[PDB]
Amino acid sequence: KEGFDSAEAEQQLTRLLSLRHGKKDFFTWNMDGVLKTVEKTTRTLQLFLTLVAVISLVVG
């Protein structure tokens, strides 16, 4: 929750599970950050498209 970053806490949980279990093992895959980057990607596409469009329109 919190809007909290996926990049954080997983390392906290990393040591956490490295503790509650005697050895690192959980080997979990990262969340949300992939959503973060794909969001940046799609919005980036919005940037390219909308910007070139609007520039062309200004040229109009």
């Binding site: 070139v52 062309s56 040229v59 109009g60």
Partner: protein, 53 residues
């Protein structure tokens, strides 16, 4: 006759150069309006095709 049509092409090519000479600046803004357009056309076509490649 097509003789006066092609002679029309080149002689009114000269007449065109003169009419543009009447407004080189207007001609400039006009042609630029063309240029940015088509250049952007081929631009986006090629780049999109390339990224697609």
């Amino acid at each position: 006759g097509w003789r006066q049509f092609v002679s029309g092409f080149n002689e009114a090519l000269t007449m065109a150069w003169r009419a543009l000479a009447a407004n080189k600046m207007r001609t400039l803004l006009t042609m630029l309006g063309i240029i940015i357009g088509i250049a952007s056309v081929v631009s986006i076509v090629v780049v999109g095709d390339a990224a697609k490649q």
